[PDB]
């Protein structure tokens, strides 16, 4: 603050700024995907697709 006092005044009260945090968290979750493919499906599709 910057207030106006008299010329013979008495030095008004103090003030400062303030700095604040944000804290923005990540370790909770994760996006994922699965397949479940066989071992014989991979074999007969190496000769039956163009």
């Amino acid at each position: 603050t910057a207030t106006g006092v008299a010329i013979t005044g008495s030095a008004p009260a103090a003030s400062m700024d303030a700095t604040l945090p944000a804290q923005l968290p990540i370790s909770a979750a994760s996006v994922q995907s699965t397949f479940t493919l066989n071992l014989k499906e991979i074999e007969e599709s190496k000769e039956q697709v163009t």
Partner: protein, 97 residues
Amino acid sequence: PLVYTPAVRGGANPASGSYLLDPQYVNSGVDILQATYGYNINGTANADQLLQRDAILAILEYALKDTAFVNAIQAVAAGSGVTTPASFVSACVTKLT
């Protein structure tokens, strides 16, 4: 029955174990906590202490930030006989039960 999740948005159950609280502004917007909450360090949680951890986190996020709970815990501290503050916590346990 209190259903509850940790109130920070994307950091609800931490994989590190150290649940870090977001800073809430207590005492009617004059002060600031900036707490954390470390999980299990002296054992496990044995299916009852999940309910006690359910109320420690709720009283530390939704209560101290509130302005009607702090004016109700103030009037207990200005009663009679409540000095040497193991009596303040024991005059508060008779009200709640």
